[PDB]
Design an enzyme around this catalytic site. Structure first.
Site, PDB file in Angstrom:
ATOM      1  N   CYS B 167       0.790  -1.559  -0.324  1.00  0.00           N
ATOM      2  CA  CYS B 167       0.254   0.162   0.444  1.00  0.00           C
ATOM      3  C   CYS B 167       0.751   1.323   0.269  1.00  0.00           C
ATOM      4  O   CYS B 167       0.165   2.413   0.265  1.00  0.00           O
ATOM      5  CB  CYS B 167      -0.908  -0.179   1.154  1.00  0.00           C
ATOM      6  N   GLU B 318      -0.178   6.676  13.373  1.00  0.00           N
ATOM      7  CA  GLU B 318      -0.480   7.665  12.153  1.00  0.00           C
ATOM      8  C   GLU B 318      -0.343   9.301  13.317  1.00  0.00           C
ATOM      9  O   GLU B 318       0.653   9.450  12.987  1.00  0.00           O
ATOM     10  CB  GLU B 318      -0.560   7.989  11.037  1.00  0.00           C
ATOM     11  N   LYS B 339      -9.338   8.578   1.131  1.00  0.00           N
ATOM     12  CA  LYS B 339      -9.610   7.081   1.335  1.00  0.00           C
ATOM     13  C   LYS B 339     -11.094   7.518   1.960  1.00  0.00           C
ATOM     14  O   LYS B 339     -11.854   6.204   1.336  1.00  0.00           O
ATOM     15  CB  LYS B 339      -8.761   6.463   2.197  1.00  0.00           C
ATOM     16  N   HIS B 344      -9.555   2.897  -0.258  1.00  0.00           N
ATOM     17  CA  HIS B 344      -8.411   2.706  -0.581  1.00  0.00           C
ATOM     18  C   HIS B 344      -7.711   1.899  -1.694  1.00  0.00           C
ATOM     19  O   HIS B 344      -8.235   0.063  -1.720  1.00  0.00           O
ATOM     20  CB  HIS B 344      -8.479   1.356   0.985  1.00  0.00           C
ATOM     21  N   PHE B 403       1.239  -3.062   3.722  1.00  0.00           N
ATOM     22  CA  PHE B 403       1.676  -4.872   4.102  1.00  0.00           C
ATOM     23  C   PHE B 403       3.331  -4.530   3.673  1.00  0.00           C
ATOM     24  O   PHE B 403       3.614  -4.538   3.032  1.00  0.00           O
ATOM     25  CB  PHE B 403       1.137  -5.231   3.632  1.00  0.00           C
TER      26      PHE B 403
END
Ligand SMILES: [Mg+2]
Ligand code: NA
Lengths: 402, 421
Positions: B167, B318, B339, B344, B403
């Site tokens: 991602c 984050e 998003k 996403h 990931f």
């Protein structure tokens, strides 16, 4: 200056550097019928399988459920490379360790089984690991986590050219400020779907004689034989290496370069010659300086001719020893470039050029000096490694004796 | 050597082209709806952000349509749009100095699933029947064809490659191209990303780990990053492409400098393939390094385009990374996740986010985080909820997580600010 301090090899003719190097110099190949499933029902039946690797004996029981065959081989390779270099990830700054790999097929065996369960049983049967066991970045992330490497890392895809590109990508990273970088690639697509997919390439040998199926540059060339495996190597900053106490290495990665051929139909020339000259310039070395060329060795007539022509244009016809050890392993895709690099470094270190197996008659047309049969003891000091990827990807790398 | 963006091309859900794309983001409305590509009934997450795409209208011929996976159609369409907007004269270009850096998380997942059904007789056979073998099967197995397809469309003969870092692909692909131009390996780069993952296998793999939202009753508000009631991201497709070139060269030719990529960096978790630590240590360092290269102080950041997937762990993750890297400035800087509106799109999202920042830098409007109605104590920053916000942007930050542990960050500044650098 970027050095190769540790190597890890997982090949069809040898699990580990020693066994591999031994088979290469002796011309022993690891080719044979595919036994992963019933290949008698498909046109192609030969492949380079690794049959002496039992994951449970090399990989932690925790990772077995979530790893594809390709990833297990990469982790095994990676671990061996780190200890070959006497490098302790736990003893190094986490951010000073990066991971750059190439991946062509990803965890295909794993994803095929997940596709089958989905349509056979239903979505609820899909593994909780399907989310990361297949994607192309898998081997970078798993190597990263297992060794606690947190520096700049990446995963690239460029078919068989990717492996060399990954190595060049690592060199860039190291030069920008990361002392150590684990790099390489490993592929495996020995399941029915992965097999049929490779056959769709239109370039896979349908031979049944393992000794005469993958013959790059031979007049009888009739396609390449697929293989599984590859190599992982540890590259690091010269200074950081010596400071680390590692004064022994395999060689230096002098230069790298990637080009892309013009679109089909353009008639314009391929970009392999350009990649070679670009790589030589980066290394600050001229054609005359090269002692040996580890050719891509497509095994497909039209591609062998193209490659022999590019090599001839740079070093002159029969102007430099050429060799294709991958004849003993088959094409390992993202693993091919890395393994070729390892084979070349070993040739430089051992003072002998790894020979090419199988090939018996090279067409005068190619105009190349192929090393066949026995290793040629010329004590090379500089080697050029070449790799191409389907659709036009070109990659060249120049190495120097340590 | 400095790199700037001279052209943009985008294909997002509810945003065909930069105009519509920007119109959607500033309007705050969403493009997340009930999945229509197939029957979602069997799955947990039945919502997604689907892009309205017409290949024929885009200009693809019969062979191209039969040949390329949906994701390559998106990528090429965007590369062409960016090429057009760049104004870069095709004749004056030296192909040997033009490269490609395409990012993609799941690549040909859609074509694989399509071919898988024909080969296996819909999952019945493990030993598939070569009688139903597509003549393009190899190119779905090895996605390399995607960057090649783009390279053929733009006439690229320099470094051409695919970056696949989950991602964070959308950011790492552009970052890679920046490094290419800076190191002198290319003068012009066509960089970006594309993913078309709205397919049974991808939805089923996200349901398995419950990464996606199970809110199927209200698709329009399913994506709610930083929200207290969030329960996962919304699966989406999309693509974006940019024309990157040497700073002096772009100035010399009188090109439009949409933005300068003054900084880029990436680091890893070394923690877990999908999990995240609450501390956000690695991402903080990534932001620090990116800012360091950019030479721009944290206080210079006028906006932060967050990752904001909408999952419990991410958003909280984050938030910690920002306060760790920006300190007090983190609390007085707008942050938002597109998003919430476009979903996403995995490897593609980072590129769409870069495009969004470039558009923000120009129009001076910060896109809102839609559906943000219930506040979460762990996410106590300012996420510009619901409505867009007028604001002068000169330097912006954008980050992403994927990931594998990848954490990436990029700094984008306008021409005005670049010329003053
Ligand atoms: Mg962002
Ligand atoms: Na073997």
């Amino acid at each position: 200056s970027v050095l190769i301090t540790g190597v890890g090899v997982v090949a069809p003719n040898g699990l580990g550097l020693a066994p591999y190097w031994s088979a290469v110099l002796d011309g022993r190949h690891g080719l044979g019928p595919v036994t992963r499933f019933d290949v008698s029902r498909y046109p192609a039946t030969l492949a380079g399988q690794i049959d002496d690797f039992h994951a449970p004996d090399h990989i932690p029981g925790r990772l077995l459920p979530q790893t594809d065959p390709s990833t297990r081989l990469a982790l095994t390779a990676a671990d061996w490379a780190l200890q070959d270099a006497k490098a302790d990830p736990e003893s190094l700054t986490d951010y000073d360790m990066g991971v750059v790999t190439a991946n062509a097929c990803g965890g295909f065996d794993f994803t095929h089984r997940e596709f089958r369960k989905l349509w056979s049983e239903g979505p609820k049967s899909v593994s909780v690991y399907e989310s990361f066991a297949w994607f192309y970045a898998v081997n970078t992330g798993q190597i990263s986590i297992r060794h606690g490497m947190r520096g700049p890392s990446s995963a690239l895809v460029a078919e068989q050219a990717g492996g060399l590109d990954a190595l060049g990508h690592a060199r860039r990273t190291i030069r920008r400020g990361t002392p150590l970088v684990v790099s390489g690639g490993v592929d495996s697509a020995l399941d029915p779907w992965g097999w049929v997919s490779q056959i769709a390439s239109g370039r896979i040998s349908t031979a049944t004689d393992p000794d005469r199926a993958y013959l790059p540059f031979d007049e009888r060339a009739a396609g390449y034989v697929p293989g599984e495996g590859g190599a992982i190597l540890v590259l690091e900053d010269s200074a950081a290496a010596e400071a680390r106490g590692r004064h022994d290495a395999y060689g230096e990665l002098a230069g790298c370069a990637s080009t892309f051929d013009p679109a089909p139909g353009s008639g314009r020339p391929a970009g392999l010659e350009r990649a070679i000259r670009l790589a030589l310039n980066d290394a600050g070395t001229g054609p005359e300086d090269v002692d040996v060329v580890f050719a891509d060795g497509a095994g497909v007539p039209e591609l062998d001719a193209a490659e022999a022509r590019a090599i001839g244009r740079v070093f002159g016809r029969e102007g430099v020893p050429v060799t294709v050890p991958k004849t003993t392993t088959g094409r390992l895709y993202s693993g091919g470039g890395p393994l070729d690099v390892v084979t070349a470094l070993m040739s430089l270190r051992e003072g002998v050029i790894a020979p090419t197996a199988g090939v018996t008659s090279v067409p005068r047309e190619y105009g190349i000096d192929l090393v066949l049969g026995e290793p040629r003891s010329t004590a090379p000091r500089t080697a050029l490694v070449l790799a191409r990827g389907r659709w036009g990807f070109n990659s060249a790398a120049v190495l120097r004796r340590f | 050597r400095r790199v700037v963006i001279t052209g943009v091309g985008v294909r997002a859900p509810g945003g065909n082209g930069t105009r519509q794309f920007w119109e959607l983001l500033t309007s705050g409305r969403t493009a997340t709806r009930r999945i229509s590509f197939f029957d979602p009934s069997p799955y947990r997450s039945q919502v997604a952000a689907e892009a309205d795409f017409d290949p024929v209208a885009e200009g693809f011929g019969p062979r191209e349509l039969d040949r390329m996976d949906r994701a390559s159609q998106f990528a090429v369409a965007c590369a062409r749009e960016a090429f057009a907007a760049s104004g870069l004269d095709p004749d004056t270009l030296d192909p040997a100095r033009v490269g490609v850096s395409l990012g993609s998380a799941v690549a040909a997942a859609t074509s694989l699933e399509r071919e898988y059904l024909l080969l296996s007789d819909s999952g019945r056979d493990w030993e598939v029947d070569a009688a139903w073998l597509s003549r393009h099967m190899f190119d779905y197995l090895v996605p390399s064809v995607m960057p090649a397809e783009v390279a053929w469309a733009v006439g690229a003969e320099g470094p051409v490659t695919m970056v696949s870092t989950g991602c964070t692909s959308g950011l790492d692909s552009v970052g890679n191209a920046v490094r290419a131009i800076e190191e002198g390996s290319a003068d012009v780069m066509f960089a970006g990303a594309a993913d078309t993952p709205i397919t049974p296998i991808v939805v089923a793999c996200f349901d398995a780990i419950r990464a996606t939202t199970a809110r199927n009753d209200d698709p329009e508000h399913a994506s709610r990053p930083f929200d207290g009631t969030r329960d996962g991201f919304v699966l989406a497709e999309g693509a974006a492409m940019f024309v990157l070139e040497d700073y002096d060269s772009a100035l010399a030719r009188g090109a439009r400098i949409h933005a300068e990529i003054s900084g880029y960096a990436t680091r890893c978790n070394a923690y877990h393939m999908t999990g995240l630590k609450a501390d956000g240590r690695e991402m903080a360092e990534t932001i620090r390094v990116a800012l360091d290269e950019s030479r721009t102080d944290a206080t210079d950041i006028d906006y932060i385009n967050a990752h904001g997937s909408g999952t419990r762990q991410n958003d909280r993750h984050e938030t910690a990374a920002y306060k760790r890297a920006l300190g007090e400035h983190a609390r007085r800087t707008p942050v938002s996740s597109i998003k919430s509106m476009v979903g996403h799109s995995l490897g593609a999202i980072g590129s769409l986010e870069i495009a969004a920042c470039v558009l923000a830098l120009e129009h001076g409007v910060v896109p809102p985080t839609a559906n943000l109605r219930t506040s979460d104590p762990e996410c106590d920053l300012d996420y510009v909820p619901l409505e867009a916000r007028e604001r002068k942007l000169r330097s912006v930050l954008t980050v992403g997580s994927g990931f594998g542990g990848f954490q990436s960050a990029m700094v984008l500044r306008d021409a005005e600010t670049a010329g003053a650098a």
